Structures are given as structure tokens and as C-alpha cells.
Design an enzyme around this catalytic site. Structure first.
Site, mmCIF file in Angstrom:
data_model
loop_
_atom_site.group_PDB
_atom_site.id
_atom_site.type_symbol
_atom_site.label_atom_id
_atom_site.label_comp_id
_atom_site.label_asym_id
_atom_site.label_seq_id
_atom_site.Cartn_x
_atom_site.Cartn_y
_atom_site.Cartn_z
ATOM 1 N N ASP A 137 0.843 -1.219 0.000
ATOM 2 C CA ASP A 137 0.000 0.000 0.000
ATOM 3 C C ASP A 137 0.870 1.258 0.000
ATOM 4 O OD1 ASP A 137 -2.239 1.587 0.034
ATOM 5 O OD2 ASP A 137 -2.561 1.402 2.173
ATOM 6 N N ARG A 141 0.205 9.313 0.369
ATOM 7 C CA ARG A 141 -0.557 9.466 1.610
ATOM 8 C C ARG A 141 0.032 8.648 2.759
ATOM 9 N NH1 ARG A 141 -3.383 4.308 0.865
ATOM 10 N NH2 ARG A 141 -3.523 4.605 -1.428
ATOM 11 N N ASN A 142 0.820 7.618 2.464
ATOM 12 C CA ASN A 142 1.424 6.787 3.491
ATOM 13 C C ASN A 142 2.904 7.109 3.712
ATOM 14 O OD1 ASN A 142 -0.955 5.496 4.071
ATOM 15 N ND2 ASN A 142 -0.644 3.932 2.496
ATOM 16 N N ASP A 155 2.336 3.160 6.653
ATOM 17 C CA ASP A 155 1.077 2.379 6.845
ATOM 18 C C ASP A 155 1.307 0.891 6.580
ATOM 19 O OD1 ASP A 155 -2.417 3.327 6.391
ATOM 20 O OD2 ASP A 155 -1.549 1.495 7.171
#
Ligand SMILES: CN1CCN(C2CCN(c3ccc(Nc4ncc(Cl)c(Nc5ccccc5P(C)(C)=O)n4)cc3Cl)CC2)CC1
Length: 292
Positions: A137, A141-142, A155
Site C-alpha cells: 500500500d 498518503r502513506n 502504513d
């Protein structure tokens, strides 16, 4: 495989203060907070994540993964809190996600910072590859900002230790072999790394904007990829396209991406073209200085 001697640390709730909600969403809300180990005379800025037996099962699996990683470009777990629903205590990254930061400060982000972030994300991922961990993932955003000069991958809710699987996942970051076959490799992390670099190079655009995820599978199959960003030279854009090759063995390795982006980081204006590139907390300690 080698025995995992990582220490799971249990933390007393009476030692934390939740200050504000940092975020809410599909997952349990994340809090900004302060951790004051009793008798230690230090205040440690922390982020606390909490989402039922199904909740505790999923959060302890993430704690397992995060407790087993120790690298400067990987987010660090401080410990867990044995609440009825378990709390994850991690280090506070004050500036938020790289996705948000790159959007909020696009008029002041230069080529030196963009390429250094690319080096640092690749170092994180190369470390996760050394530990036989597939993040699954990776996305802007992570990636969290500790300082604009330091970023960490954060994440691990989907991470697996090398993969076949069943479930929901973000399609616009996934290698085509994952979309079609639920296969995941360090090489499919390389695909998502290319999308992550594209997110950075476009100052935070959304890939395949306004295209249904059901369509993405066949867009990729006909040969289409994400467009070259305006700031990007063919040198940078070619590295992305290489991460999006069909043959996963043909994509670069994370150790090669470190080298390439490191080289481009010594002459940033030759590789990214950006207009005007030249232009009581006394006892606070960051988690990276509080060891045991
Ligand atoms: C446009 N407005 C203007 C203000 N900006 C927001 C910027 C984004 N926000 C934020 C999120 C995290 C941190 N620090 C942080 N450290 C450590 C952690 Cl683990 C952490 N996890 C986290 C937090 C929220 C949501 C999701 C997560 P995940 C799922 C990546 O774990 N977060 C600092 C900030 Cl500011 C809040 C302020 C953007 C919105």
C-alpha cells in the site's frame, strides 16, 4: 527463517494525553498526543491510532509488523496500549502526509526536496525488502513528514512477510499482476513507488483522475500509463515508466532507484524543471532520541 527477537512494548494509558484528532476515516481515528514515561523526565510527541475482536486482531498484526522494523525511513512504533480496543502508539510526524504537504506547499517545493524524498522513500523500501516485507500500500498518503528534510513510510495495515490474498485494496497504485492475479512482490511495491513519485512530481495530483477503478485494469492492459509531469525531464519520467513495466523482473530494484535518484540529487535543476527553483515544552524529546 531467523527468529524475531523484536520487543513488543506495552504502555500505560495513564502516561498519555490525547490532545487533538489528527484524522478520522475508514480506519479508527488518529490522535496527536504526549507520552510522559513516569520518572523518566521526558515528554515524547506521539500519534495514537485506534479503530470488537476483529479490530484488536487487525491492530495487533500491524503492531507485529511495525515492532519488527528499525530503519530511519520507516515509521516507528513506540508500543501498544492494552485498552479494550488496542491503541497503537507511534512517533508524531508533525507535518502530516507527504501528499498533503506537497499540495499545501507546492509554490515553495524545489527539485532538491523532491529528489531527496525519492531517495528516502527508496531507502525505506529497500530496507523493507531486506526484511522480506511487502508493504502492498505504498502511496504518497502513506509517507509522513517528520521535517521537510526527513520522510518515513508509515502504513503497514496491509503488509505481509514473504503473496496471494482476498480483499479490498487501492487499485490506482497497484501493479497489473496484482489487479488481475492478487500476486504481490517487492517488484509490485516498485510499481506503487512509481505512482508515488508521480504523485510527488505533479505536486499531489490524483492518478487516473475521475476514471472508475473498474476501468483502470483495462487502461493498463492496452499499454496506457500515467502522463509525464510538466516539471519532469525524460530522465525522471523514464524511471517512473520503468516501474510500470509489465514484466515485474524488468522494473528497477529499490537499491537501483536509490542510486539513480541520488545521482539526480547532486544536480537537481538538470532533472526537474521548476519555475524559480533557487528561491511548557522544555523536556520534549523526539522518539528518535528516546531509546531503551
Ligand atoms: C488542509 N488541512 C490543513 C492541515 N493539514 C493537516 C495536515 C494533515 N494532518 C496530519 C496528519 C498527521 C500528522 N502527523 C502524524 N504523525 C504520525 C502519524 Cl502515525 C500520523 N498518522 C495519521 C494521521 C492522520 C490520518 C492518517 C494517519 P495514517 C493512516 C497515515 O497513519 N500523523 C500531522 C498532521 Cl497535520 C492534520 C493537519 C492538512 C489539512
Amino acid at each position: 527463517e531467523a527468529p524475531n527477537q523484536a520487543l513488543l512494548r506495552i504502555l500505560k494509558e495513564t502516561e498519555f494525553k490525547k490532545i487533538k484528532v489528527l484524522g478520522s476515516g475508514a480506519f479508527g481515528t488518529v490522535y496527536k498526543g504526549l507520552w510522559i514515561p513516569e520518572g523518566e523526565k521526558v515528554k515524547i510527541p506521539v500519534a495514537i491510532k485506534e479503530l470488537s475482536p476483529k479490530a484488536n486482531k487487525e491492530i495487533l498484526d500491524e503492531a507485529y509488523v511495525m515492532a519488527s522494523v528499525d530503519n530511519p525511513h520507516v515509521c516507528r512504533l513506540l508500543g501498544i496500549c492494552l485498552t479494550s480496543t488496542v491503541q497503537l502508539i507511534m512517533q508524531l510526524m508533525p507535518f502530516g502526509s507527504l501528499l498533503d504537504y506537497v499540495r499545501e506547499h507546492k509554490d515553495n517545493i524545489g527539485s532538491q526536496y523532491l529528489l531527496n524524498w525519492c531517495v528516502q522513500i527508496a531507502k525505506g523500501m529497500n530496507y523493507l525488502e531486506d526484511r522480506r516485507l511487502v508493504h502492498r500500500d505504498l502511496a504518497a498518503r502513506n509517507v509522513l513528514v517528520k521535517t521537510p528534510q526527513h520522510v518515513k513510510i508509515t502504513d503497514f495495515g496491509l503488509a505481509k512477510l514473504l503473496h496471494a490474498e482476498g480483499g479490498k485494496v487501492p487499485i490506482k497504485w497497484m501493479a497489473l499482476e496484482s489487479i488481475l492475479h492478487r500476486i504481490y512482490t517487492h517488484q509490485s511495491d516498485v510499481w506503487s513507488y512509481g505512482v508515488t513519485v508521480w504523485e510527488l512530481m505533479t505536486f499531489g495530483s490524483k492518478p487516473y483522475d475521475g476514471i472508475p477503478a473498474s476501468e483502470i485494469s483495462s487502461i493498463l492492459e492496452k499499454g496506457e500509463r500515467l502522463p509525464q509531469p510538466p516539471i519532469c525531464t525524460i530522465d525522471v519520467y523514464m524511471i517512473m515508466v520503468k516501474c510500470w513495466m509489465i514484466d515485474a523482473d524488468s522494473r528497477p530494484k529499490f537499491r537501483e532507484l536509490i542510486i539513480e535518484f541520488s545521482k539526480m540529487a547532486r544536480d537537481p535543476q538538470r532533472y526537474l524543471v521548476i519555475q524559480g527553483d533557487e528561491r511548557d515544552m522544555d523536556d520534549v524529546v523526539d522518539a528518535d532520541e528516546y531509546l531503551i
